Design a protein around this ligand. Structure first.
Ligand SMILES: Nc1ncnc2c1ncn2[C@@H]1O[C@H](COP(=O)(O)OP(=O)(O)OC[C@H]2O[C@@H](O)[C@H](O)[C@@H]2O)[C@@H](O)[C@H]1O
Ligand SMILES: Nc1ncnc2c1ncn2[C@@H]1O[C@H](COP(=O)(O)O)[C@@H](O)[C@H]1O
Ligand SMILES: O=P(O)(O)OC[C@H]1O[C@@H](O)[C@H](O)[C@@H]1O
Ligand SMILES: [Mg+2]
Ligand SMILES: [Mg+2]
Ligand SMILES: [Mg+2]
Lengths: 313, 432, 48, 24, 48
């Protein structure tokens, strides 16, 4: 029955000549601009509340004269660490690679219009809409905070070795971490450090968070290291999108580059000893589907991974 | 009878029990005068209840949500230790029965089949069955099963602990006010209390009334029930098996807490409602058999909406997310089918749930010996033999052979003797 | 009657992928010299 | 089991958009 | 039994058990009695 179904779906598998008749069903509620509005209480801020705005009033093309955002900067960011930009954003060049202490920082947004600079204060304005809050908040860098996400995937397999199949498509499985700050499951990843590229950041954050190898667990056996290097040598950048992260403000927003490491055979993924470390509590293999409740816009990232791999979602 | 003035609580070291006054031990249990209260007041609601047509009395303790479950476990151990002596029969299985209480309507054949499996498992393993404390649905049915079980036993009677939220009980007001040692207080199930309408089950042997300063609110005892079973499971080194028959939203929460605390669950498919939702979710996420390739998240969402009635998209998202979070770990959920598979395979599902845990390997071999499944024990030993594991096997083989002799299982005796157990290096449990 | 509203999403999903296969002249018996029926055919195929 | 594996590998068989993270 | 259908099953189980007794089919009698047919709620076809 399994082969008959598999051979049957291997046969009748499949913008011009395309018609949408959903307007007959819904009516005037066919499509709406369902943009992102962050929650009212800023995370880890001690009860500081934003200026509430409706989702239909957010884009920068719209005027909106009744706009009084709150200026908030976190004490950790205001203490000036190595990964935080100065509080006065003058002399900083946006939309090009800028050198801070001889280290390269990206500073380029994936928005087609680009980043516009305010004449009064020199601070950047977010092109993806209004968020009801100025200042940097919990984010250390003015403007675009580059994040790298690592989606390490394998086919969801039964003990007999056959891949699980739902809705006529093969089912994926990704490594998911439970975040320390807000206890929601998420894709491993982190902010891009100064002087580093997406390759190093993606690999380093996956090693630190999902495996816990960042000076805290033990040294890997060194035959296992070759397997992990083999896994990391074939990665495809699937998306570079704007994050729906609740820490985003008008002067600092997170934008992610997503790197997918797919294990076709499943041999290298099975040798990974998952153990949450650094800013991750627990790490586990989790089935990819459309009903997942993950942190920020990681569902969109998983949608892009399944779109690229022709997997179930 | 003369009221107890001192009680024997087993020490935290697990080496002996020390005797201390009841009010000193009992000071650690709290109650809430109102919802707003956090620190609390001394409990003052503990004792024994006398039910009509029941010879023995059942102890009750009203405690707060913030109380340590180990302390409640010590309370249950201290009463059993007081009544039956220090060397009472320890449980090798904790069977938690949860599910539908009001709208628990089922065909008679399904009950009898679950009842037969539950009765056999309970009688073979001397299990402690923990259900809710009320006189409704599957808990009341389970109470009838252990009522029939309570007659053929001669000395040791396994407790039927009922954990219920205080505030819904019609005899709740009478029990709290008064002299703290209440010996044999009469419980009136037919008496009319205007705000509360749910009575206690007369067949349960012990009662834990969990309090949070609320009235007529359900589902407040779920976290404590999962934590108490997990604490009991660690203390007696016995696997905890939750069984899910029908159920509403709180049964979903019970299963969620159970899977979060590491306790395996056995979901009875074909009984309808929340069990069908959980079984559908598990079969969609893990089962590679062919019938389940047309399963979708949309049909699952439709099932959650048709069963639970969430009335909003965000509520539907939280229930659906919770249901998917229950069946995330395939080892912790075991699905029993009362309409597809065989009649005598429910104990195999319970044993598979026992076998799915991480530790308590000697107890797992003992559990396999109780259910008379040699093949399961043989496969576990063969896997251990292939996986080296010589240290863990040598430490537990002697006690298992000893246990097999005590419970009269000769096939298990020959099996354990074949797996490198020297006959003269057998050791007794107590010290002479 | 009104449809259950979970079933509506399925019908909307079915109707979102349609291909115009033909635009032909109908051999309709009501056709005359000054009024004739011409059809556009839309195919909604359910692969699964 | 042989056909299932063979049909399964006959399905998901497979310098621009290529990233090397071995430097980490 | 799988399809719920409790109303249609309860209305016809009594007459079927009665019919099974009249036509001498004991296996059908045990089967119908196993499928929740109360023995004392059996009704005659005519009125006395
Ligand atoms: N333990 C209970 N006892 C009696 N009645 C209850 C209980 N819990 C809920 N009810 C009532 O039943 C109504 C819905 O019934 P169910 O759907 O059966 O409630 P359910 O969610 O299944 O019960 C959850 C409870 O059952 C126990 O097995 C378990 O401990 C869990 O706390 C609720 O509105 C409530 O008034
Ligand atoms: N651009 C950045 N923005 C905000 N926090 C950062 C940044 N870079 C490093 N951090 C620090 O790194 C922590 C978590 O990021 P990471 O470990 O890289 O996932 C944060 O809580 C900060 O302490
Ligand atoms: O430093 P943390 O918060 O762990 O990483 C930043 C995360 O916030 C999300 O928007 C990014 O996609 C990224 O996954
Ligand atoms: Mg990190
Ligand atoms: Mg991180
Ligand atoms: Mg970092």
């Amino acid at each position: 029955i399994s082969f008959r179904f598999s051979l049957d779906q291997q046969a009748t598998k499949i913008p011009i000549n395309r018609l949408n008749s959903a307007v007959a069903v819904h009516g005037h509620t066919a499509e709406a601009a369902e943009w992102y509005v962050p929650p009212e209480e800023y995370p880890k801020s001690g009860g500081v509340k934003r200026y509430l705005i409706d989702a239909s009033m957010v884009p920068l093309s719209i005027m909106c004269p009744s706009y009084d955002p709150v200026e908030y900067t976190h004490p950790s960011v205001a203490a000036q660490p190595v990964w935080a930009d100065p509080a006065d954003p003058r002399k900083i060049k946006f939309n090009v690679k800028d050198e801070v202490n001889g280290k390269v920082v990206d500073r380029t947004s994936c928005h087609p219009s680009g980043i516009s600079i305010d004449s009064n204060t020199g601070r950047p304005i977010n092109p993806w809409g209004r968020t009801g809050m100025t200042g940097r908040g919990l984010l250390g860098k003015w403007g675009v905070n580059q994040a790298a996400d690592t989606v390490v995937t394998r086919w969801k397999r039964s003990p007999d070795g056959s891949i699980l199949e739902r809705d006529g498509k093969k089912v994926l499985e990704f490594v998911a971490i439970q975040r320390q700050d807000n206890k929601m499951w998420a894709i491993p990843g982190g902010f891009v450090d100064n002087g580093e590229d997406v390759a190093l950041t993606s690999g380093r954050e996956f090693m630190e968070e999902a495996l816990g190898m960042g000076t805290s667990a033990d040294l890997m056996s060194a035959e296992s290291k070759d397997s992990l290097a083999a896994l990391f040598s074939s990665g495809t950048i699937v998306a570079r999108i704007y994050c729906e992260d609740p820490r985003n403000t008008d002067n600092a927003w997170v934008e992610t580059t997503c790197v997918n490491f797919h294990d076709e055979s499943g041999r290298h993924a099975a040798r990974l000893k998952l153990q949450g470390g650094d800013d991750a509590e627990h790490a586990r293999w989790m089935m990819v589907h459309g009903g997942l409740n993950l942190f920020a816009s990681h569902r969109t990232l998983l949608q892009h991974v399944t779109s690229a791999l022709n997997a179930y979602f | 009878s003369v009221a107890a003035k001192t009680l024997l609580i087993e020490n935290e070291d697990g080496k002996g029990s020390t005797r201390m006054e009841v009010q000193d031990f009992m000071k650690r249990f709290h109650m809430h005068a109102s919802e707003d209260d956090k620190t609390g007041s001394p409990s003052t609601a503990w004792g024994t209840l006398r039910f009509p047509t029941k010879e023995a009395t059942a102890p009750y303790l009203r405690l707060s949500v913030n109380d340590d479950p180990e302390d409640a476990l010590l309370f249950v151990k201290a009463m059993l230790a007081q009544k039956y002596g220090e060397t009472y029969d320890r449980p090798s299985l904790i069977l938690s029965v949860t599910g539908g209480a009001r709208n628990f309507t089922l065909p008679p054949r399904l009950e009898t089949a679950i009842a037969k499996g539950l009765r056999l498992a309970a009688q073979r393993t001397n299990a402690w069955v923990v259900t809710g404390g009320t006189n409704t649905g599957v808990m009341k049915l389970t109470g009838q099963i252990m009522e029939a079980l309570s007659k053929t036993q001669s000395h040791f009677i396994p407790p039927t602990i009922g954990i219920a939220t205080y505030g819904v009980i019609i005899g709740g007001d009478d029990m709290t006010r008064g002299e703290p040692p209440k010996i044999g207080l009469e419980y009136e199930m037919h008496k009319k209390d205007p705000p509360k309408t749910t009575p206690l089950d007369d067949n349960h042997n012990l009662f834990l009334l969990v309090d949070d300063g609320s009235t007529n609110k359900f589902g407040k005892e779920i976290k404590f029930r999962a934590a108490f079973e997990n604490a009991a499971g660690q203390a007696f080194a016995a696997p905890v098996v939750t069984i899910v028959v029908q159920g509403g939203p709180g049964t979903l929460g019970t299963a969620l807490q159970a899977v979060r605390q590491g306790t395996p669950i056995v979901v009875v498919d074909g009984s309808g409602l929340a069990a069908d939702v959980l079984a559908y979710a598990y079969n969609f996420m893990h089962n590679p058999l062919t019938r389940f390739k047309s399963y979708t998240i949309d049909d699952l969402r439709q099932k959650v909406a048709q069963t639970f009635n969430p009335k909003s998209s965000q509520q539907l998202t939280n229930l659906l997310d919770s249901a998917l979070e229950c069946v995330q770990d395939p080892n912790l959920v075991v699905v029993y089918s009362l309409q597809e598979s065989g009649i005598d395979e429910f104990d195999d599902c319970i044993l598979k749930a026992i076998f799915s845990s991480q530790g308590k390997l000697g107890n797992k071999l003992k559990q396999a010996m109780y259910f008379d499944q040699l093949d399961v024990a043989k496969r576990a030993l063969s896997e251990a033999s292939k996986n080296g594991q010589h240290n863990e096997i040598a430490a537990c083989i002697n006690d298992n052979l000893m246990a097999a002799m005590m419970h009269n299982k000769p096939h298990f005796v020959e099996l354990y003797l074949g797996f490198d157990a020297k006959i003269y290096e057998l050791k007794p449990s107590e010290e002479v």
